[PDB]
Design a protein around this ligand. Structure first.
Ligand code: BXX
Ligand code: BXX
Ligand code: BXX
Ligand code: BXX
Ligand code: BXX
Ligand code: CL
Ligand code: CL
Ligand code: CL
Ligand code: MG
Ligand code: MG
Ligand code: MG
Ligand code: MG
Ligand code: MG
Ligand code: MG
Ligand code: MG
Ligand code: MG
Ligand code: MG
Ligand code: MG
Ligand code: MG
Ligand code: MG
Ligand code: MG
Ligand code: MG
Ligand code: MG
Lengths: 855, 853
């Protein structure tokens, strides 16, 4: 019995990512293969790790043995240009089928095979502990193979992991013989309560490419080949399979190379033949530089017996080259006016995880030592996220997209700049191209959509807000939307985006509301208030209160005229600003902004509202390229998404907000795209559906609309779905999410990778809002109040988080129950549907309280 | 349709257009162009921006339809940044398609539920047997046939949009926007054709320089010669607006919609109040690829079919001098041959550039000569695919021609003065996706390749000249990878036994095909030395059998005494006696004939085990990479050559058949799911194939040779050919059915058999299937042509000879020759060992039917 939908081994795009926040990753495919080896501070989809696989030797008592790689057979194209290569070991026998059942962060892959005399499943995960970014940021994974004997005789089983270290690649050069800038090492090690293989490399400690790996177990019943033979030809693999398939046991290799000297095709041109053998060490110095080892675990299973064969795979690449080194913020794109600290600071910035764990073994030792608590938290998380009342579609959308936050798109730097003081700083690309970062600078117009980190790892988001307000905001309140100064470099010379700058203000409110830390807010307040004032002063040119004229946005273009994206975000920002200003005692600003907001709201209703939705008012929709006029913009109510999430309620008349959301769905949602015409980028096509960025149901399409109008972005789908949940439009929210997640169901794209400008795209983290909207969760740390208001009536059960603690809430039978899995919770009031359920509620981790509602 | 329908869902399938040495572009089973590789390197997976065909169909008094002329995509859609702008993946397409390939011709039939017309694409690059230049045009026909099945007229526009491919450079100040030069496109009408002519402002001798064109002879055109270039993709949007509006196009009044760099594209250091930029100045700051559209417009009556015919041509005439590969490095060279490179200069030209120095020249030729070129191509297809061969065998023979016309092979114009003026054939072993695989016209690989020797023999002769005149030393040591064609010093690695002696067998093959004794005499001093080298240097125990360490195609050395080396040597000696005796080299004729009889006796006394031939060695594990009493699939490779060379059986017939039977019985696998290989994979899962070796009687080494557990199509082919000659038809057919099933489109492409690279040269062993099936024996010296089909009864085959090619049709009482090209002047025609005619002459276009009594 599996709760998650079975994804077949034929679904080639599927990749379940292991790893945690900022650690880099390796993934499991639906065949149970390891893939996408990307530990080294850059994405690397498709990177093959030579000779890195799990295998089984099953020896039935009195029967023929079977030796297989623990993967389902490949399918689809087999036309590799040089065949599947030696180091892929594609020619070893594999299993009939598999089914992958992912409830991120946990996966189960159940193998089926008619020849193997045992049945195998893989359970794998990297712990996720809500509100604990370090515990959720271990550079390691559990790979636990459960083996069952369904037969009638005992079977002696060996499960063996064979692994190469990934470190050391280099571009052709005198420093990179054999494509490797250093020689790897591997050794058997037993220390720190664990045992297994410890990999290293003789690169300098400060080399960006320096790193370690380990494959370990706490199981005493091991058989090992610590280092495979390194020859010119792949003798090592052949000898490994001979050794395993013979007896299910392994031995260390007596000779680490079978070469005596360079010979034949490998001979040195200027070499004397009849020259005698070199020593083993001299010969190894001339040979390939990757090392491989095998760790086996051996147990005999009686008929009906089940046993776990448990491994940890760990890694460490502590060093990043200082700087984004992206594709936007080049030296010819820096402004002066902020001094360049980069010389004065080292050329390396460390990954935060490398402070706690100096190398791979340290991370493995911790994961193994603390496994019961780390796994127990992870399991409690999974049960609350996937085992509650949410439609499975919504739980899928919320949980699967956490992978983006734990992907190469995001990372955590240790003390990159003295301007922020000491400690970790979260930063991120927008996305991950297959082999490089996409769109540097913790881009504010994109990241404003992302909600997941604000509810699961709020300290990360706070650390980023500090960078924006302390480093990227000038004295006028102009804020950059890509941040370069985290690295001690000058700012990017491009100026503000309206969505970026005002969405960052909204996020400051969100962060402050979650944590209740007025000192956090006070530090950033002079800068933040300037960025809100900047809008009314600089972006309203006709004095009506509506932002108007040329403003840059997340569509990489400027809107002209007067339109809702900018204005409804501004309205939301003003309302948030009143809450913050008022609480801090900035009473003058609070009253000014409240009155401004009232005017903005009336002007939006008077000008942008058309009786059905909000739209762009412009003299001539074709005067400027890249406009939309009377089209329906899916993001017209983005401000209202933030407002709902921020506890600010409706910004505009409820019937008009619901009308506009209904118009977005009715006009912009496509169930099928056969008849769609787009010259734009494709994230949805053919017999898929999706929410278009814009459409023109009443005409008025420009010759050249904004450049993404005909596209489908999951982040925009999510935000609209969220708003629909808050507005009571459940069926339409579910329609949007079912349609979107169908595009990511494994058939054509992976559930764990929603894409836009890059894999693991930050905008996809809008999805967390589905949980908040479905549950009506409103946590106000300043007031110490928690309320719920589920979209659907009757019984409900959801995950929730707050700054102090996390757990489950269960509603129904005229009661409300809180169960706290981590931290603490101290509530002045708990409300349900606007009514007080209880006062003065104090819980610690492991406790539950059930309150009966008033009749 | 005669060819099997491959569905549009078969993503690996790619039908390659282009010819010998031209570079290529392919059509996938969706009808899409893919694998743009014109520029003297492979480039599988290269996307050409904004390069596609579209249709506008405007029913009289009905709503119009505008579609890209491609079937819907399928499979994985998880591109990291989505399908990009320039792929135009979001435009409406046709529901489905079926691809019917009889290489060199393809038909792609589209199906759509709503389009008001039906469409098919017929495409080809001509192939004219025995005419390598006519088969080497850097152009293709793309002929869209549109049918109006309705009862009202429909006005149809078929429009080709294209971008030139030239100009890429590594990111840097030298390649703004990824481009080292700026492209140009214009409307042109000259040389009897019209359409779009593309160029680039790179220097005339730049390796990256080239041209492209999209042309028609149809007078009914509508054109947008140059799309708008903006920072954003305004060009494509304006194109589709223009096509979908009315099915007609216009030139763009403005070639960019930018006035100056602004916003995200602003120059930080730009004077914010600078003088206005001209259009030409603004273009200079913008992407450097250019795109144009050529439309053909016709109103189709109810029931009417009309062809919308285009030619796509290209020309990248300049190659860097050298292989620039991954084996023959400038510090892997030996001294002793003069380095001519500084004198000759850094470029060598493609031979096709002599006739066709730009794209328009090639197009103009293809259009002008299309009736003759297409007629020859069509006759070729009818003979190869429309005769009596089992369709599996016709598929294996014909589809693999693609390797010869791929990036694996090329033809240099006068690369070295040491060979005199004219074309020189040279080749990789294969094509990696983005680079050549294994340079040097590798002789141990190319010895398996038969297709060029029967279809384009002059190419093979030019390569033999390089090997004997440039790569053979005074001792008779021949290199197996050639550098001297470029004027470069020789590779330092020494000879391979299969390569050196296989080349000698190919010299005999070439000479027998062409009958030119001057060709043979020029090469004879060197060639004779290479055969004598073997008995002198490779037989250490003086028993006549080659023994000890010898390098081979498996990239290792066999030790002991074994049949691959020895049976090839036997074959080469028999060929040597034929050549020596004809030349009047009576000394060598007698010496080699004695040596050959001794070798045959010794093979039978030592290597034969009563069932097959095997390696005799003290300890199969003493040296890595041996095989001992295993069954080596290539053990009778020499006999494959002998059969094709008219030398018959080398060893007792029953022994040769027993060995072949052992190879089939022991090495052929119907299913590979339980196979245990740590080697490379060209066959797996529920596929079958012929393993390189197996150990049915035990004696498997711990570390056998490094490819023993693999499956190579070239070795499947050679064994299947030998089985045909030995009368083991059913087993040959099973081998071929099993291997071609691996390339049926479900997992791999029919037109790309793989080994160390795509389009692998060893796969050209497949031609021998036609030879074996038909029993064709052409001896130009004797002017005799004979056939001896494996199967009884009526038969109909393609054949080739030096002078002419066509079809042979065999019946009970008669044999018919139909000649499609050239001429045939036979001393004697034989069928099944009997004389069928004497003094028979035919010219192209003639048919003669001769009585067998
Ligand atoms: O296409 C890349 C190719 O380059 C060589 O290293 C091949 O092994 C590989 O497949
Ligand atoms: O896909 C669009 C996104 O990609 C980047 O250019 C961003 O600026 C933009 O929001
Ligand atoms: O579905 C019919 C088409 O009409 C336009 O709105 C397109 O988006 C849509 O796909
Ligand atoms: O595949 C890697 C990615 O790098 C960037 O150029 C993207 O366009 C591309 O898709
Ligand atoms: O696939 C094997 C082939 O690849 C190259 O190394 C050739 O030498 C060899 O014959
Ligand atoms: Cl946190
Ligand atoms: Cl404009
Ligand atoms: Cl020729
Ligand atoms: Mg890649
Ligand atoms: Mg170490
Ligand atoms: Mg063993
Ligand atoms: Mg202004
Ligand atoms: Mg205004
Ligand atoms: Mg549907
Ligand atoms: Mg589908
Ligand atoms: Mg509600
Ligand atoms: Mg590629
Ligand atoms: Mg020109
Ligand atoms: Mg038009
Ligand atoms: Mg001997
Ligand atoms: Mg299949
Ligand atoms: Mg005549
Ligand atoms: Mg004549």
């Amino acid at each position: 019995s599996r709760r998650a939908r079975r994804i077949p081994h034929t679904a080639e795009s599927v990749a379940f990512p292991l790893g945690g926040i900022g650690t880099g990753n390796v993934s499991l495919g639906a065949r149970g293969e390891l893939r996408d080896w990307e530990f080294e501070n850059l994405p690397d989809k498709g990177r093959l790790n030579p000779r890195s696989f799990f295998a089984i030797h099953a020896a039935p008592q009195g029967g023929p043995s079977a030796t297989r790689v623990l993967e389902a057979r490949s399918s689809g194209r087999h036309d590799r240009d040089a065949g599947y290569g030696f180091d892929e070991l594609a020619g070893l026998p594999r299993l009939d089928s598999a089914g992958l059942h992912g409830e991120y962060p946990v996966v189960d892959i159940d193998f089926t095979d008619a020849t193997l005399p045992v049945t195998v499943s893989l359970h794998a995960f990297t712990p996720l502990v809500p509100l604990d970014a370090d515990a959720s940021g271990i550079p390691a994974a559990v790979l636990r193979y459960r083996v069952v004997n369904p037969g009638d005789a005992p079977v002696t089983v060996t499960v063996v992991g064979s692994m190469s270290h990934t470190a050391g690649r280099g571009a052709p050069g005198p420093d990179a013989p054999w494509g490797m800038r250093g020689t790897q090492s591997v050794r058997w090690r037993e220390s720190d309560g664990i045992r297994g293989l410890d990999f290293d490399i003789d690169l300098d400690h400060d080399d960006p490419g320096y790193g370690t790996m380990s494959l370990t177990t706490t199981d005493s019943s091991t058989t090992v080949k610590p280092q495979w033979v390194t020859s010119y030809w792949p003798d090592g693999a052949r000898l490994f399979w001979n050794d395993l398939a013979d007896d299910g046991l392994l031995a260390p290799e007596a000779r680490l190379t079978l070469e005596d000297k360079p010979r034949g095709l490998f001979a040195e041109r200027d070499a004397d033949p009849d020259a005698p053998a070199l020593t083993e060490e001299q010969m190894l110095a001339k040979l390939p530089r990757v090392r491989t080892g095998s760790l086996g675990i051996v147990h005999t299973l009686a008929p009906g017996e089940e046993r776990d064969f448990e491994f940890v795979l760990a890694w460490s690449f502590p060093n990043r080259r200082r700087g984004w080194h992206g594709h936007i913020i080049f030296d010819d794109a820096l402004e002066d006016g902020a001094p360049d600290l980069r010389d004065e600071l080292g050329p390396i910035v460390r990954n935060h995880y490398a402070v706690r764990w100096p190398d791979a073994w340290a991370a493995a030792a911790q994961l193994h030592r603390d496994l019961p608590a780390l796994e127990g938290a992870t399991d409690a998380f999974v049960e609350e996220l996937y085992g509650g009342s949410l439609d499975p579609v919504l739980a899928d959308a919320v949980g699967a997209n956490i992978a983006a936050l734990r992907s190469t798109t995001c990372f955590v730097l240790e003390s990159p700049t003295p301007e922020l003081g000491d400690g970790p700083v979260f930063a991120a690309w927008e996305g991950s191209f297959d082999h490089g970062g996409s769109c540097e600078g913790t881009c504010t117009h994109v990241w404003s959509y992302a909600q997941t980190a604000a509810w699961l790892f709020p300290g990360l988001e706070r650390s980023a807000r500090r960078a924006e307000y302390l480093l990227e905001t000038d004295e006028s309140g102009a804020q950059k939307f890509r941040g370069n100064r985290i690295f001690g470099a000058p700012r990017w010379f491009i100026g503000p985006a309206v969505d970026g700058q005002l969405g960052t203000f909204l996020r400051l409110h969100r962060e402050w509301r979650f944590c209740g830390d007025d000192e956090f807010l006070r530090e950033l307040w002079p800068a933040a208030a300037r960025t809100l004032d900047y809008a009314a002063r600089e972006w309203d040119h006709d004095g009506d209160g509506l932002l108007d004229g040329e403003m840059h946005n997340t569509y990489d273009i400027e809107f002209h005229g007067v339109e809702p994206l900018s204005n409804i975000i501004h309205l939301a920002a003003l309302r948030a600003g009143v809450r913050m200003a008022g609480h801090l005692g900035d009473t003058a600003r609070a009253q000014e902004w409240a009155l401004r907001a009232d005017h903005v709201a009336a002007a939006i209703e008077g000008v942008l509202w058309n009786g059905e939705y909000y739209r762009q008012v412009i003299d001539d929709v074709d005067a400027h390229r890249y406009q939309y006029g009377d089209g329906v913009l899916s993001d017209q109510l983005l401000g209202q998404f933030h407002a709902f999430l921020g506890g600010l309620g409706y910004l505009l008349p409820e019937a008009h907000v619901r009308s506009a959301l209904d118009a977005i769905v009715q006009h912009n949602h496509r169930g099928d795209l056969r008849d769609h015409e787009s010259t734009q980028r494709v994230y949805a096509l053919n017999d898929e559906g999706g929410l278009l960025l814009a459409s023109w149901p009443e005409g008025g399409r420009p010759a050249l609309p904004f450049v993404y109008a005909d596209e489908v972005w999951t982040g925009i789908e999510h935000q609209v779905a969220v708003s629909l949940l808050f507005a009571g439009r459940y069926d339409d929210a579910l329609r949007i999410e079912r349609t979107l997640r169908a595009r990511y169901d494994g058939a054509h794209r992976s559930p764990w990778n929603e894409i836009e400008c890059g894999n693991h795209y930050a905008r996809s983290l809008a999805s967390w809002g589905l949980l908040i909207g479905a549950s009506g969760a409103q946590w106000d740390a300043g007031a110490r109040t928690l309320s719920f208001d589920p979209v659907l009536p009757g019984d409900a059960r959801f995950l929730f988080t707050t700054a102090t603690g996390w757990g489950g809430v269960e509603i129904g039978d005229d009661v409300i129950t809180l169960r706290l899995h981590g931290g603490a919770l101290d509530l002045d009031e708990l409300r349900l549907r606007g009514e007080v359920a209880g006062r003065g509620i104090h819980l610690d981790a492991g406790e539950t309280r059930t309150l009966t509602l008033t009749l």
